[PDB]
């Protein structure tokens, strides 16, 4: 029968016009049951309806419709592990949001996707139910009720087929852990698939670096306990033999640079095949071709493995592709940071030839800024251009503000409270401002730094620093005196190699020495300063205003910041008071720490450390005793009490500020002193020379899984602090404190590891050469921040 009008009872979201036109029918056409069914099927195929009931009341097709209800609210119950935010984001991934229609067909897929997310997280018992509560006006409240369950953790990572290396040794380098000791910080036993793949590639690297060019990971089984609480990772490998690298033969499109590449692909006579070295020379060929203007110099090293001689011939197919030029480098997401802050980290120049190495260097430099959670790159191709690209750096800004509160404890500083508030990207300008503070047993420090990391485009940083320092010497195991200092330092740090960094600065420091214990060395310095106090009146006072030119040179070629195994860190830091200061003196310091690995795995290292220092007045004056050098404690000479090494305080007879018999009150007259007296308390020296041969060895009685997480070492520390200005002629009864020959020595064991409480550094050192007065504490330790 003919159809004239189509009613749409039940429509409240799809416009009657839209619903009508979505049906492939126009008014005035002949409709039979076949056409009715076809219209129903198409109208429901529009994906807006959950019930179509076309009625024939009278001569009009009353298209009764049940509409796809709108999601009134998305709620979550039982998702304790995961906050609602990422749940809602993963819902948006499926287009499910408050105000969107609930199709009732994808919710099963959505809860299945949530369960898949949980299974990735490791909660393999996780359950998700999408309950729908009807609400008036055709609405549904979607309650995603979760039963996360226990997160499965790796009970065992097993390698089958490893005979050249123990399973523990191989697994130690995996970011998936089957054992996480409480005392150590090795990681978590949680399992992620991407971590499993990264660990398989770590195993590949481990074996290909030792010459196992035929190494192959036959399979990787991941098993669950029936309770789905434990995960077992079995890596079935077939490590071949150790293959030698006979030679590297290069071919392809070398762009006329075959000579330089050939000099790059030079190997020792039949060395041991090393996948790391092969990739290193591939990257060196990439760098060479990039320095020749090639943006994407592809270099594929295929090893032709001859099992007969067990050798490898590296066919390095090199295709130095086209030259692409960066029309412009864009930054997306630098809403806080100004453009120059991101752009001055670009090693790739805009308006230059593209180098993938340079673009990745810029990306990693942007990551190193710390201003961004993510820094992706996109070398988009300029429209209608064969060789022009835009390098878009899509960053996502972080909260560069950070307040830290650390607590450490050590035999040196006692309880060390550190606090701080830092803005590393002040107003997105790249200025790192921040107020820090420290509180040891003996020194309360409070700093306010403001460093422009790029005072010059070249990277020369300029940093001001307002410091305050209340140093109670007696708490530092020195002779009693309280130096309350404060002042400024404006320092230009000049980078010169990315390993060497100079820094020249001008500083002001006002020092107020109070409660100075009457002693020979302090009063020598004070007499040199034109003040003539009395050896009585322990409550002395002395204020100085010193303008210093500080200089510094930090060479830092340590491959690892934590537990270095190779390289050297030298730090020559000096300080010369400029004319116009109250104190006239220079003070040079030279730290050194050379790690020489004596094996292949870098497990056996020799740390040759040294700590030199020399200070002295510039004529008539004398270096302030409070700038003296100290030795002892678990920083210079272990097994010696902090600062004990060196000249000891020669005290004068005086009345004690506090008098209480049976104390000796630092040898006071009121206690029964009448002449100059020696003492066991150190004053430091204007000269200092400390050294330490520390044989770092693998930690013996500990699983290879995390034996590299603990640094064991056996150290021999030399150290002599001396007062070059000591009046040997005038003080003949007392020990000659101007003697560098008084080389204190200690030998001991040291154990470092990154415990949950912080970097723990214990050491037991016996001082086998200590002079009179040198207080020795054998067990040093530091629970650092």
């Amino acid at each position: 029968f003919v159809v004239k009008d189509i009613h749409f009872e039940g429509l409240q979201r799809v416009a009657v016009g839209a619903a009508l036109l979505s049906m492939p029918v126009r008014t005035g056409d002949t409709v039979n049951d076949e056409d009715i069914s076809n219209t129903i099927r198409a109208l429901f195929a529009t994906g807006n309806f959950e019930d179509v009931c076309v009625l024939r009341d009278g001569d009009t097709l009353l298209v009764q419709v049940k509409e796809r209800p709108t999601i009134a609210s998305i709620t979550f119950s039982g998702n304790k592990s995961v906050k609602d935010d990422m749940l809602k984001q993963n819902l948006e991934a499926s287009g499910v949001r408050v105000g969107e229609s609930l199709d009732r067909t994808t919710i099963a897929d959505i809860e299945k996707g949530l369960e898949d997310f949980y299974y990735s997280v490791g909660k393999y018992s996780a359950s998700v139910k999408a309950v729908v509560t009807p609400l008036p006006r055709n609405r549904v409240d979607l309650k995603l009720v979760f039963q996360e369950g226990v997160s499965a953790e790796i009970q065992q990572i097993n390698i089958v087929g490893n005979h050249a290396f123990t399973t523990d040794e191989l697994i130690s380098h995996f970011q998936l852990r089957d054992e996480v000791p409480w005392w150590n910080v090795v990681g978590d036993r949680k399992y992620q698939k991407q971590k499993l793949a990264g660990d398989l590639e770590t195993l590949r690297s481990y074996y290909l670096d030792r010459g196992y060019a035929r190494f192959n990971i036959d399979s990787t089984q991941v098993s669950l306990t029936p309770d789905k609480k434990g995960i077992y990772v079995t890596v079935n490998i077939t490590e071949g033999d150790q293959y030698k690298l006979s030679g590297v033969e290069v071919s392809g499109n070398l762009a006329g640079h075959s000579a330089e590449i050939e000099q790059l692909t030079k190997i020792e006579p039949g060395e041991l095949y090393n996948g790391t070295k092969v990739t290193k020379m591939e990257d060196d060929i990439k760098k060479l071709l990039g320095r020749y203007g090639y943006a994407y110099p592809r270099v594929q090293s295929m090893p032709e493995i001859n099992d007969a001689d067990k050798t490898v011939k590296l066919r390095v197919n090199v295709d130095a592709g086209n030259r692409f030029y960066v029309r412009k480098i864009r930054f997306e997401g630098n809403d806080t940071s100004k453009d120059a802050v991101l752009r001055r980290e670009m090693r790739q120049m805009e308006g230059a030839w593209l180098g993938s190495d340079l673009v990745d260097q810029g990306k990693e430099r942007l990551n190193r800024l710390g201003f961004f959670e993510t820094v992706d790159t996109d070398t988009q191709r300029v429209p209608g251009s064969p060789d022009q690209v835009d390098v878009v750096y899509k960053v996502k800004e972080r909260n560069t503000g950070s307040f830290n509160f650390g607590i450490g404890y050590g035999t040196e500083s006692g309880v060390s409270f550190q606090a701080g508030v830092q803005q590393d990207n002040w107003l997105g300008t790249g200025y790192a401002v921040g107020i820090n503070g420290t509180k040891n047993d003996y020194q309360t420090y409070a700093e306010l730094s403001v460093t422009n990391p790029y005072f010059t485009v070249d990277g020369v940083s300029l940093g001001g620093r307002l410091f305050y320092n209340d140093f109670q010497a007696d708490d530092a195991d020195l002779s009693d005196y309280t130096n309350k200092s404060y002042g400024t330092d404006v320092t230009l740090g000049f980078p010169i190699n990315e390993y060497n960094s100079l820094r020249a600065g001008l500083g002001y420091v006002h020092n107020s020495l109070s409660n100075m214990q009457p002693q020979v060395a302090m009063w020598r310095y004070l007499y040199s300063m034109g003040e003539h106090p009395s050896t009585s009146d322990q409550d002395n006072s002395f204020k100085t205003d010193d303008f210093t030119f500080n200089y510094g040179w930090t060479y830092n070629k340590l491959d690892r910041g934590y537990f270095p195994t190779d390289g050297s860190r030298v730090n020559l830091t000096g300080k010369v008071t400029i004319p116009g200061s109250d104190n006239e003196y220079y003070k040079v310091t030279l730290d050194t720490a050379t790690y020489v690995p004596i094996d292949d795995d870098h497990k056996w290292v020799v740390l040759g450390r040294t700590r030199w220092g020399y200070g002295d007045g510039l004529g008539g004056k004398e270096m302030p005793f409070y700038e003296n050098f100290y030795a002892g404690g678990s920083s210079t000479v272990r097994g010696f009490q902090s600062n004990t090494i060196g000249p000891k305080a020669v005290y004068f007879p005086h009345q004690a500020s506090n008098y209480d018999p049976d104390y000796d009150y630092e040898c006071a007259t009121q206690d029964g002193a009448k002449d100059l007296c020696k003492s066991d308390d150190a004053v430091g020296g204007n000269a200092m020379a400390v050294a330490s041969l520390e044989f770092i060895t693998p930690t013996p009685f500990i699983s290879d899984k995390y034996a590299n997480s603990v640094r064991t070492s056996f150290f021999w520390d030399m150290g002599t602090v001396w007062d070059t200005n000591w009046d040997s002629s005038q003080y003949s009864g007392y020990p000659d404190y101007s003697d560098p020959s008084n080389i204190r020595m200690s030998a001991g064991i040291a154990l470092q590891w990154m415990s949950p409480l912080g970097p723990l550094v214990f050491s037991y050192a016996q001082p086998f050469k200590k002079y009179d007065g040198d207080k020795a504490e054998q067990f040093q330790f530091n629970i650092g921040k």
Binding site: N399, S402, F403, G406, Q418, K785
Partner: peptide, 7 residues
């Protein structure tokens, strides 16, 4: 121990 919280 050092605890760092980013504001």
């Amino acid at each position: 121990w050092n605890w760092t919280k980013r504001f």
